[PDB]
Every structure is written in structure tokens, then in C-alpha cells.
Amino acid sequence: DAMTVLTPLTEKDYEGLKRVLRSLQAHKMAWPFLEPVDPNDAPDYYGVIKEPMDLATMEERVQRRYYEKLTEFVADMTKIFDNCRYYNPSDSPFYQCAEVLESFFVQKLKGFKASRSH
Amino acid sequence: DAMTVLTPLTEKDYEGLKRVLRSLQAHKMAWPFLEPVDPNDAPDYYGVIKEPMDLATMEERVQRRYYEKLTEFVADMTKIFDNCRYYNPSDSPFYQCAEVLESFFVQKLKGFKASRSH
Amino acid sequence: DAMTVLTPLTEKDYEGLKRVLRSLQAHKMAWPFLEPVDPNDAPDYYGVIKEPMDLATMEERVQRRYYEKLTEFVADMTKIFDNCRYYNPSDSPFYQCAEVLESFFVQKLKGFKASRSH
């Protein structure tokens, strides 16, 4: 979509970004992405993931208006999952929780790209 | 079913394992993972992706009958697309090809799991 | 076709002209042509394109009844795509989008050069 790349993010938009973000935080499968990875559960995590991400941190950025474009937002989200699938094994819960939450996200994202324009 | 996990791969199994692979080798979108990553293109690749995977390397492995359970061949397949979304940017052509191939694989693999049980 | 050049435009015709225009304004790939180019996007545009055109300026015209023959309407349409391809790079979005819609409008117009003879 044109507008996703090009049309910048208004106060209205950011309002509905917080709305989507909260939906993720209340999701049943979000339990592994609400906060940052603990370096004690996994030394080498921050050493082998170049750009880690969580919803705790995406909440900061949505409240600090970090994202000039809907594009910078959908990147940082997809980090959460691409990073989770990369570091964990295909048969782990952490992986499954990411596959589920990403599908959900896309739906909650599809509704936001639609409600922007018409 | 997941007799995927438990039921060793027989010879007729390895049949559609090779056929499913030819079909990924055909795809117009398979080009990015037909062969191993060249480290002239990307020096730091091999140092930052832990278990690289191509389809050439995987095709060898279907010839050595490297795989005792279907579980193993699908781990190694999904490596390719997880490595790719990890290493590249989301709006990348590579990243789009992994998104598209994998969905293909998944439909071609859905077929295989059913043409094993009944 | 003879009918397009000499037989002029009935009150009917002008209904199925506004109806095709409508169809182009729906399309997914019509987004770059629904209104006039902005001069702040492109300060040289209006000085180097001799006859710009948009579906908004064309809805005005179809309504005002500006077009005596069908030849006139299809010119003003084709300005939109030839101007685009001229001013924008072959490999660009705007360009690709013009390709999609000229291809479409053609068939949506083949269906009008046929509802005007039987």
C-alpha cells in the first residue's frame, strides 16, 4: 500500500497504534514478548540477535512518537517474531507463540491500514 | 498426522521427499536459496547466521538419506526462510521470496503428510 | 472502430462513461491518479508535462459534458498514463501503477465499445 510507506503518521493514527498494541498485550499468546529477553535466561541472546525487540519497548516508542511512518512501526514489530524464530527451534513454544501472535497482528494490522483511508 | 515425529522415513517416503524438493527447486521464487550464500556478496553472513541452509545442500542430504524422521527435514527446510527473514530487511526481495516459498512448501508439505497415512 | 470516431455521445453513453471512470476510481492501483499532481512533490512537473490529467479532473469533465466524441475521452485518459511513463522511471511504482490501470481501462473500455454496437 501507498499510504503505508508515504502518508506520515498523524495524532489520529498514533491513537489507533496504541489501540492495536494494547490488543497484542492482552493476547493470550503474548506472554513471551511483553518485556525484553532476560540475559540470564539466555546469555549470548543480545550477542547474537543484532536488534532485539519487545512490546514493552514498542510501547515506549509509540508514546514518544518515534515512528514517522507506518513502515518503521511494522519493522520493529516483525523483529519480535523474526528474532524469536531465528534464535529458537521450530518445535519450541516460544516459536509457536510467535507464529500465532504474528498472524493475529497481521489481522489487527489489516484493520488499521483499512481504517486509515476510508 | 504427527506420525511426522515418530514414524521413520521409509524408501517410498524418500520418494516424495525428493519430489517435494524438485518442486521447491522449480518455483520462480526459489532462486535465492537454490545454492549456498556467497561470502563475496556478504562477508559477515557465515559469521552471523549459525546454521546456513540452501536447497543444493539439502538435496545432497536427501541423497545420503540423512533424515530418519520427517521432523528433521522440516527443521532444515525452515532454517532457510528463518535465516533469511533474520538476515535481511523485511521489505527486501529475499525476505519476500522466503515468505512466498515457505507458504508454497507448507502446501506441498501438507500434501506429503496426508499421502503417508491415508 | 467507426463508431468511436463519428457516432457522437448520447445521454446513455455518458452514463457508462461516468460508470467506467467510477471503476477506475475503485481500483487498487488507481491510487496515484485519483487527483492532480502536487507541485510540492515535483516542482518541475507542471513545467515539463504539457497536458496533465487525473481522474478527478476527468470526473469534472464527464459531468460538464466536455466530450463530443469518444475519441476525446480516451485521449484525456491516455494522457494520464503516457505522462506518467514519460516523467517517471520504468522501474518505479507510479510507472508500474500506470501499466496496471491502462491495461485495465482498456478492457473496461473494450466492454463499452461493445455495449454501444449491440
Add this chain to the structure above:
Amino acid sequence: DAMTVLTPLTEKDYEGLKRVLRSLQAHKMAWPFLEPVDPNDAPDYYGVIKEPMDLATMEERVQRRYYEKLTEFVADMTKIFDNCRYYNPSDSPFYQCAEVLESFFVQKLKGFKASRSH
């Protein structure tokens, strides 16, 4: 296609860049694109057209091994057809010859894009 944008043009490539070019110089409708637009035919042309092109200027460029990728060769071909539809009227001969000849180039170009994959 990935190969078109990224694979550098070998000398075998260039051999049958000359074939595609001469097959176009042969065409029955290629006649108005063989040589540069004459300033006496159209005093404004070279002022109102930012980058003119022709098959002769491109025969020179294809001989002097000027094109690093296939991407650059098709860009200059489609200039001939974009500059033409832009400058001339939709109902002019020159305009139809670009319609006819580009459409043909496109097929010669399909056949060369697959002569390369293998």
C-alpha cells in the same frame, strides 16, 4: 526477475543483445526509430524531450559494451516508446508503431530472459 537486475552482462550475453537489437531493426514497424529524430522535422523535440533514443544510438552503445546490467539496456529501449507516446498524439502512426514495436520487443525480451536462465 532477479537475474535481469543483478547478473552482470557477459560477452555471451552481449552477442544476443545484438540479435534482439537487429531483430528490431528488421521489423516492419521499426522504421521511425532507426535514427535520431531530426531537428528540422520538429524544432521543439529536443527541448521538450529530456532523453531521446533510437536504435542506431543503441547499436553504438551495445557495441561499445556500455551496459553493465540487462536492467540498463531495457531502460533505454523503453525510452524510445515512452518518449514517442508522450510527444505524439495517441492516433498518430509513430504512436502506433511504438505500441506495435514495444509489444514485439517485449516478446524478443521474454525469449532472451529465458535464454539466460539456462
Add this chain to the structure above:
Amino acid sequence: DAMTVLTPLTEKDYEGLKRVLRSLQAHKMAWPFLEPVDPNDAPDYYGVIKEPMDLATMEERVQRRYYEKLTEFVADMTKIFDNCRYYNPSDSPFYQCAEVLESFFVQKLKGFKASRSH
């Protein structure tokens, strides 16, 4: 002057017009402006100058009694020198020739205005 704008040109007017014009055609430096710019000298000229002009085209216009007010005769003359300084480099002879000739025109034009105001 009020007269130059408002007082229509009569026959004795048009006779001073022709005297002024020939004085210019005589000038040591009128040479670049005696006739239309040749598109073979400068392919882009006619496409990048919206209203070219010459002392020849104007001598026709003075014979045809084309000018209703002195205002329009002066306008078309200042086109010659404006279009020349615009198109050409300032250190060029054509640029210098317009600088000189116009200053000449101006003294001759002054004369003509008081040869009128009585």
C-alpha cells in the same frame, strides 16, 4: 508614458515604426537577431523558449500592421533580448549583442516617443 499604452498607432506612427526597425537591421550588432534561430544550430532552442523572435518576423508584423498599440511592438522586441540573455551564457557574444542592441533600441525608442507626443 500614457501615450505608449493608450494612443493607437496611426499611419505616420507606423512610418516611424519602420524607420526604427531598419535602424536596428542596419546595426553593426544586429546580426544575431536578423532572422529566426536555426533549429540545426540549437535543437533544444525551440522547445525551451516559449516565444522566439527576430527582426525579420517583426518586419512582416510591421508591414501587416499587426500592432494596435506601441505597447505590443516594444514587447515583441524585448522578447529578442530577453530570450537571448536567458538561453545564452552571459560571457557570450550573442549575450553582449543583445545588451548593446537593446540599449540602442532604447535610444531609438525614446526618440520615437517624443516624435509622437506633440
Add this chain to the structure above:
Amino acid sequence: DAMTVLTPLTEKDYEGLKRVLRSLQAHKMAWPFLEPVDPNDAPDYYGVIKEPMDLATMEERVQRRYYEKLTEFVADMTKIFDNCRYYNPSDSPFYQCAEVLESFFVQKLKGFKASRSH
């Protein structure tokens, strides 16, 4: 003058180039040239004038020591006036302001050429 063409610009030179440029911005008739032309005032301006210019861009350039010779500096100035006279009517004020200011600059420039040598 020899010195204007050949003798590069010292730090002292540049001091008095800003001195002159200031004087221009002081002038009551500088008002149409103090900053760049607005594309919304005039959509075609930037597409049909090839090298625009303004005292604001010229201040930047004098502060970046962009001009090796007094010759480049005086060109860029004279764009402002030639561009104005070309795009606008002889009888317009923008035109009449270009005239007045250009005459001024010449005088201020006369004095700067003279303050260089003795």
C-alpha cells in the same frame, strides 16, 4: 577586467562579496528575490526555468566559499534577473524590480571591482 576572470578570490574578496550581497538584501526592490520562488505561486516555474536563483541561495553559497572566481559569482547573480525577465511580463513589477536591482548591483559591483586593484 583581467582580475575578474583570472585572479582567484581571497578571504578579503569574500568579505566584500558578503558586503555587497547584504546591500542587495537591504534594497527596497530586493523583495521578490530574497528567497526562492514558490512552486505553489507558479507550478511550471521550476520545470521551464533551468537554473533558478535567489539572494538566499547566494548567501549560503558565499558562506560555503563556493566561488573560486568573481566570474562565477556574477553569473549566479545575473541568473536572478535574466530568469525574472524571461519568465515574467515586461510590464510586470517582478520585471521592473529585476531591472532596478540589477542596475544597483552593477553599481555595487563596479565599486567592488575597483576596490580589488588599487
